[PDB]
Design a protein around this nucleic acid. Sequence first.
RNA 1: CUUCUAGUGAGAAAACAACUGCCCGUACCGUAAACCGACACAGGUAGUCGAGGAGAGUAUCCUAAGGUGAGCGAGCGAACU
RNA 2: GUAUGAGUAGCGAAAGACAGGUGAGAAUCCUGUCCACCGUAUGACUAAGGUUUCCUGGGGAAGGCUCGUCCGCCCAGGGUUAGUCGGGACCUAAGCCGAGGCCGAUAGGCGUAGGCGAUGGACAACAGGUUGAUAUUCCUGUACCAGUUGUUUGUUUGA
RNA 3: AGCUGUAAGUAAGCUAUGAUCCAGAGAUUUCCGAAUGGGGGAACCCAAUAUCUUUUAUAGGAUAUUACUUUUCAGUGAAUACAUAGCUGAUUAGAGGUAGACGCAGAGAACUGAAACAUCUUAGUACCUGCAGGAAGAGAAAGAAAAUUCGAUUCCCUGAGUAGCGGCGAGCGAAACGGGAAGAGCCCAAACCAACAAGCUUGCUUGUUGGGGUUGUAGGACUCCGAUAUGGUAGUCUGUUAGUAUAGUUGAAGGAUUUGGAAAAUUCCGCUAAAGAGGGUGAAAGCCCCGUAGACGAAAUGCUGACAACACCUAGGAGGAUCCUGAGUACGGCGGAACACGAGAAAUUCCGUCGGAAUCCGCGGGGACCAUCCCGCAAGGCUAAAUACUCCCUAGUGACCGAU
Lengths: 89, 54, 101, 61
Amino acid sequence: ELLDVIKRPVITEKSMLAMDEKKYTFEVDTRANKTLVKQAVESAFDVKVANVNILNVRPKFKRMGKYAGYTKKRRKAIVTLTEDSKEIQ
Amino acid sequence: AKVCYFTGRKTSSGNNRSHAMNSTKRTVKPNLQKVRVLIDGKPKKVWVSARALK
Amino acid sequence: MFVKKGDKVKVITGKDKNKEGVVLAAFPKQDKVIVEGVNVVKKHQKPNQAAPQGGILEVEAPIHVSNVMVIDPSNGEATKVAFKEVDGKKVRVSKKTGEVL
Amino acid sequence: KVKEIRELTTAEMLDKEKQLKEELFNLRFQLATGQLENTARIKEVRQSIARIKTVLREQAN
RNA sequence: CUUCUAGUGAGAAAACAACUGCCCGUACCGUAAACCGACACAGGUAGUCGAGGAGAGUAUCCUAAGGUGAGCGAGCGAACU
RNA sequence: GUAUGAGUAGCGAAAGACAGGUGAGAAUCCUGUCCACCGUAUGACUAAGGUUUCCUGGGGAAGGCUCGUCCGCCCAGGGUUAGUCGGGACCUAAGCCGAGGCCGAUAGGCGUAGGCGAUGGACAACAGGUUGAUAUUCCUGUACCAGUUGUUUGUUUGA
RNA sequence: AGCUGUAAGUAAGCUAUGAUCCAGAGAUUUCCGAAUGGGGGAACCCAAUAUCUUUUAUAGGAUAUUACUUUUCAGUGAAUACAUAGCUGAUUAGAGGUAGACGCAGAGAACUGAAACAUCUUAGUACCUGCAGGAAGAGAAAGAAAAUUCGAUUCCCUGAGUAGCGGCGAGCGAAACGGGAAGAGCCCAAACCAACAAGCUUGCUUGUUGGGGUUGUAGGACUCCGAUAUGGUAGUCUGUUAGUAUAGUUGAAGGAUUUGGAAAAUUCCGCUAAAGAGGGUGAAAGCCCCGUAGACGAAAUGCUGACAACACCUAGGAGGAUCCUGAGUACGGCGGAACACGAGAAAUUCCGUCGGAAUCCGCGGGGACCAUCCCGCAAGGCUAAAUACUCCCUAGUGACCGAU
C-alpha cells in the first residue's frame, strides 16, 4: 500500500554513522518484503536503491508497577543508495 | 452386520441367568445375511434379515 | 448541576456561611464548586516550573454544591430555582416572583 | 465536517485521500526527529480519512 | 543427474554490456553462578580442536598458548574426632 | 503471631602479599608488581536447553551465606544486517495421517491411492580489515550459481 | 456547558455553527480457530487459475475462485454392444459451540444395607454417547368399570404406607373411583371415478396425477332422490389503528438561637403533604441536593392485541344385492426384559429366534382357562394449554454475611 509501509526513521548513534556511508534506517511494517520496502522508498523520495537489508527485533520484558508485559515487535530495514540523498532533519 | 436395509433389526443386550439366578451381561443379535437385491437398478450386496426374506 | 460556572452564589453551611462570590469552576460528577474567596487553604510547595520559588501559597478549595444558593441578579435575595416555559430556551425561572436567572 | 465532503465528486474524493495519506507520512516523520509543535493534527487526519471512506461507501450503495 | 525415443510443437547456439535474486535464525551463556538437580548446590550434559621435555601413549610429573586465586576473616597452636 | 534451644551449629574442596587510587566508609572494588593453581583441561569452537542474562552511563532498599564504592541484582538508553552458512520454496526411512473402502450398541478401529516426517541423500565464496556491542551477513579485493534485457529456416527434423 | 477513560503529570487541542454524554438503526471488523486451496509444532508456511498493477524486463504488490459428503440436472463415459459402475461441471443442505440447568433414547458400575454373603438392595443411580425444544414426552379408547355408567392426554390433593411383591428376610410399594388447574380436535391407506403412459389380450393387468373417503349407535363405496348453503382455523412475515420495551420532562414546603472546626443536634416561631420510600451533604434534615406521590413524552427499531383482506376446511334423508376397513401382522413354542408384581396359578406391554390367522355369520379385552353377558375396533400420521428449568437482562425483597 506503499504509504503505510515505511513507519519512521531510526535516530541512534549506530545509525548516524551509517548516514555517512549513504545508509538509512527505518522501522518498517511487519509483513513487508525486502522488495516491497525498496519499491516504497524509490516511490516516496525519488532515489535509486542498492540493497535493502532487513532484521527482526524481539520484544522486551518490562515491569513498571507490579504489572509486567512486553513491548512491541519491530522490523528494521537499512537502505543503501547509489548516489543521491535524503534530508531527515 | 450392523442393521438391515428394510426393517431395522440391530444388536442389543440381555442377561444370562444361571440356575442360582446370577446375572451377567450379554449380547443379542439378529440373523443377518448378505444378499444381492435390485435397489434402483444396479444390484447391491446388503445385509438383510432372514425374517424379511421369508 | 443547578449552578453554573459564571454565577453569583451565597453560602449556606460551613464557616463561610453568609459569604457571596462568583463561581469559578464547576465539577459535575463530583458535585463540587470553586467559589471566589471562600475556602482558602495553605499549601507548601517546593520549586517547580511555575514559581521557581515555592513559598506557602493560598488558593480556594472546592466545596460541595448543596452548600450553596443562587442569587437573582436584579434583586439580590437567595432563591430556590424552578424551570418554566419561555420561548423555548428553558431557563431557570426563579422562585420568589417568577424572574429569569 | 462531512458537509463539505458531500460537496464533491468521487474523483476528487480519491484525490484528497491521496493528499491526506501523504500528510500522515510527513507528520509521522516530523514526530520522530524532534519537530511538530502541534501534535493534535495526527488524530484530525485519521478522522478525515475515515469520513471520506464512509461517505464513499454510502454513495456506491 | 545422464541418456532414448513418443511428442503439443516460428528459430534457439554464443559473444559482450548491464540489470534481478523471496521467508525464518543469527545477541550472550554453553565440562556452567545463565542448561537438568527448590540454592551463586563437591552430582549429570552429544560432537570437533587439544602443544613441549622424558615416554609406546590422550598414562605420569613439570610447563607453552590461553585461563584462575574459587563471596567470611584474624589469632592460639588444649582434650577429642 | 511470637518464644525456648542461643548469640549456639553452620557460613558448601583450593594461595596470597604489599604499594598506590576511589570514596562518607575498603581484607573483599580499581591499577601495579612479585608469588601460587589447571593445561586430553579449569584452554578454543559448537548442537540442545535458557530466553535479554549481551554493550554503554548511573544506583545501593532488598538478593549475594561476611563486606561492598561491586555484580548474572536495580533504573535509563542501545545492540542481532546473507542469492552462496543452517532450515523452507528439493528427496525419501521408521512412524504417522488417510478421498473412496472394509469392520463395529453408540463413540469409533483399521487401511488403498495420495501425503506429512531427518537423525540420512542433493545442493553455487573466499582471504583480510573494521564496532562499545554483528560479521563466510558490513567494507575492500578477486569469484561463482540461476534468470532478464539489449547489441554484436519444411517442429518434417538433417535446426 | 463543559470535555479529551483508569490516572496523577505535562504537552497540544475541541466546544454555544451545540462538544463530551445517553437510546434506536447502520458502516468498518487484521490473524487463529468447524477452518474448508495444500501443509502444519494454533495465531505460521507454500500454491494454481483469471483480471489488475511496479519495472525496459525478470523478480515484487492486489482482488476473486479452488475441501469433503448429499440431492437435482447436463456432458463425457465403459471390463462388455445396448448401458451401469466411474469422471468432469452446475445446484442443495450439513458440519461446530454451549446454560457445570431442564427432556427423550443407547449402553450401564461399585463401596454400601441385609449387623457374614451368592437371590435381593444401593439402582436403571453415577459416569459415557446420540438426538433435541423453548419446553420435551404423552395425546383423541381394540380405554376405565359393573348398575343406574363415563368419554383424548398432562399435572396437583386424596385413596395409602392400603392391596400386593419378597433368601415372605433386609426391604420395595400401586391403580381406579372422589375433589381441582387446563381444556380441542384433526388428517391418510383401502374400495370406487376420471385424465395420461406401458403391457397396445384391441381382456383390462402395471403405474402417474386429480376427485372421493375416514368409523363401532358400525362407517363407507354403490343405487335413489334433496341441497349447490352454512358453521369454523392450530394460517400469512398482507393492511388499519390501540398499547408496549428500549432515552427523557416537570415535580410542594425554614429562618433565627446555644454548643462545636463544621449542625441535620438544642430552644423559639412558621410552613408543606395524592410527596413523612431511600440515598448524599463537615455530626442525626418532610421543608439544602438527588429523588418520591402525581402529571407529560418517542424520530427509529422490535413485540403483543383488535378488525379487514387473502388463503384453506366443513351438508341431509333411503336402500341393504355386492365390494372396502392397515399380513409375515395379531398370535403360539423357546430365551430375556418392563409392568409395585423376584415364574409364580401369571393376565397386560416390549426385544431376539423359529412357527403362523380370520374378514362383520368377524376381531380384541374384563389378571391362568372355558361358557354366557358387557365395553371397545389393533397392526397409519399430527396437535395448544394446565407441569419442569435459569447461563442471561430489567425492578425489587430478606427477625441472610459483614473481611479467618
